[PDB]
Symmetry: D4
Subunit: 150 residues, 8 copies
């Protein structure tokens, strides 16, 4: 893609509901050309889709947690554990990272009780788990994963 | 909000581009009523906006990191540090968590070089930082922060 | 309950032996009404009971310890371990906490010898224990678990 | 004190509201003698007082925390910090322990918000604090500090 | 024992080769009485024996190490491990300590090679060992275990 | 020195009170030659002296501790701290070790109170101390620093 | 070897392509004598060989890592693990160290992907591995293992 | 460069003293062409130079260490510390790594004494050092930094 695509994405990452006319005027290109470029970005897998940004508080998601999960070595324990973690309701992020050489799991729940029942108790029952450390998020300074172009 | 709003949000969290007709049919309610409910959710701050989901790889964001930053105690060092972290280009998430009682910073860069120049070198220059630990994400098992209703 | 119940509890948490007359005068309500309110709090499970506060030193409880116990993952090891810990003579507090994601055990003994025989040796024999760390309390700055209303 | 005093304390630690007659019958001694012995225990500082046991949940104390606080060395930082910690509303226990060679603080709050405002923010402002680690209690297996005679 | 015994021990802890006459004069008591008191201390198990203090360097004991050894929980692993550690040639001290809740082993060897062959390789072969951490002593500021009376 | 000196030291390390005749017979050499060799070892600094081995329990030394002390970097803080540690009454061993790159301090006290007053409180007042960790020895499996020849 | 050999090695460690004449002049000795001394050093195993120093960047070796690998205790797990680590393509250094009492592995790869496929995934499949921690090298301040004479 | 250059480098990384004829025969290309390609690699900075591989033991380099050094945050402490570390005699490798987010220093000395005098004492005097951890290498399983093509 080119610089024009980047300018388009820079806008769509923040507000996908801006009419074509508005965007066409901002970047200075024919509306039909804008539409074409957008359709091409979607087809090329650049734009994966469009989502509504919902306020977690509105859904009473008050118990936010980030958990480190260490896996037992051998067989295929690591890859398997990653998959089991990602299937847990409430879990939106699962990453394997170097340094701690383990999984970092991002999740959201309405209450401590839900967290315990849906997440912790389930993870505690997984035998290939060596250790876990749950950091309770008590403050979200910033959370805009949608912003990929600064 | 009610159960109907929840069903609507459950759809919009995945695809905000579904025509009203389609959604109206799925949930079984008048199109005008659907439109009204959606407009009300936006006005009540439930739906904060609509974003395009862009594939990080398409932008060559190959260097993904999660960093723990500990702050010096006293004065207003903690709150201040949180703000400085959130302003760094590439940083999309900043949280203060219990357990490690520190900040967890999510960021994305194209290369090691960019990470060093834009993030690490900047953080290294902040005196109220006591310690930092950067975990290099080498595998994204799952990352769907948009999914708030499972 | 109401504000009056709170004022009553604020007194009973410190001294349950204050005559009804005295309390009735302090909060300014009929003695019969005070008695009724207290009886209602006990019946509603707010007031669980009344205890004598005994000075641990008077019983030569000189060896005070706080131990972190990590459990093996899988099966029902975690819940089971918690129960085994709480049954040990001398143990008055057992909590499962996030962060270290393990159990914190509060106990009191007369001497190192008793601690070893009654607590440590018993815990050491439990196979589902992964690690333990005993912090020896050498100074009790404050310990008033009875104070719930500040 | 003697064995009889111990039997008396073993009862009073659980229920201080048992009439003298009842206790007199259980331990087999004259009521007047029981009353005398109890009065003597109070005078000798063995029985410090009588408290009502209030159910924390009844007061919505849902955010329970245990925090480790490390102090800077030198001057009188350690002793001073201990005192500052014990004065924080919600804090019921403060201990200095060996091993981690730091303070362990027990506290209770109604919500995350109260915890942050009353405890964490206050501690964060104390300059002689080197590090803190807050363990969020998500399960109280046992908490009977009143039981000193097993 | 009394104050006189203490004065005698204070001398014998440093130099057991001081003639009776000399000690008798220093503490001001009959020589026969001194001899008697010393014989009594040996008989009562206070004085366990007399040793020559040999300079480790004279024996080329250049590789001094302090190792922490963690044991697996369950069965009698802990007590057993302690015994196995104490039997290793070169090991002069074995302690079980709280805090790290493990064994601390003091040993001396002539070279890295001897340390590896006699100690490390042997410990590495013990299955009930969970972890070990060997601290290499590069400086002996003080080592006078014989001094028990300051 | 030679093999004969080693055999002599192997005996003196355990019992310095064995008459010359006895040792002369065991190793098979003239008594006068034994005496000469011993005198030479003392003169050459091999045998530093002779001590009485006193049972710590006999002196009620019930509070045994091993503490790790980390020093601030810069100036001459490290060397200085080592000296301050070695001068504390009760401290018999002070070592600087690699790995943790800090000081390990061995000490003995009669009670927790003495430990606090004589050791901990003093160390807490030293500003160049960065961290300390005191391991409470609850079991002495072996402690024979006098044995240098196995 | 002597001082002259050392001067020769001091040169060869930096540049093995200096003609004999040049070296002969610098150190002031007959060329034939220089050649002889060099041949003798090679024969005595002092000079193991001559290598070309290749710039890692020229080969796109952009992913540099240093990993700590802990081994399970018992049997011959430790020695065996060391050998398995050293056989992994990309691994140039494997050391067993005290302190962490584990293996430190130095390796180089072109990309994160290669690192994952050739190193991490392979190590993850080894059952006798207890833990691993990979430090991502983001800056090579100095790397001149060839310099042995300063 | 091409595949032929790679084959040439694969040989030169192990033995830079192979005559041109030998290499020319192995890879199957004109000797003059081989010479040209090698000269081009040197000119393009691919081949930085040629070194003699000296056996560390031959120089009595028996004390091998790997040290982690943490730097204070702020100003230019980090970059500056890296430079100071790399200038220490005996230090051949200095890297800044993520995970521990600190410096890893590789060094070699003949004895503990030299290590202390040349390295440790010098580092201890640097005020911007927050912590250090020296791992003593007691076994070199593999060390072939020259091998860049496997
Ligand atoms: Mg989005
Ligand atoms: Mg979204
Ligand atoms: Mg109470
Ligand atoms: Mg009570
Ligand atoms: Mg002795
Ligand atoms: Mg001795
Ligand atoms: Mg070389
Ligand atoms: Mg080379």
């Amino acid at each position: 893609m080119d610089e024009i695509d980047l300018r388009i994405l820079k806008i769509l990452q923040y507000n996908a509901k801006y009419s074509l006319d508005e965007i066409a005027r901002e970047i200075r290109i024919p509306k039909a050309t804008l539409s074409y470029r957008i359709k091409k970005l979607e087809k090329d897998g650049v734009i994966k889709g469009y989502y509504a940004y919902i306020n977690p508080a509105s859904l009473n998601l008050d118990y936010i947690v980030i958990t480190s999960v260490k896996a037992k070595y051998g067989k295929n324990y690591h890859v398997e554990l990653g998959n089991k973690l990602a299937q847990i309701p409430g879990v939106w992020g699962v990453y394997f990272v170097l340094g701690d050489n383990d999984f970092i799991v991002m999740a959201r729940y309405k209450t401590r009780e839900e967290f315990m029942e849906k997440f912790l108790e389930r993870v505690m029952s997984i035998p290939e788990v060596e250790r876990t450390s749950t950091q309770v998020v008590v403050k979200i300074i910033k959370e805009s994963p949608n912003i990929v172009i600064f």
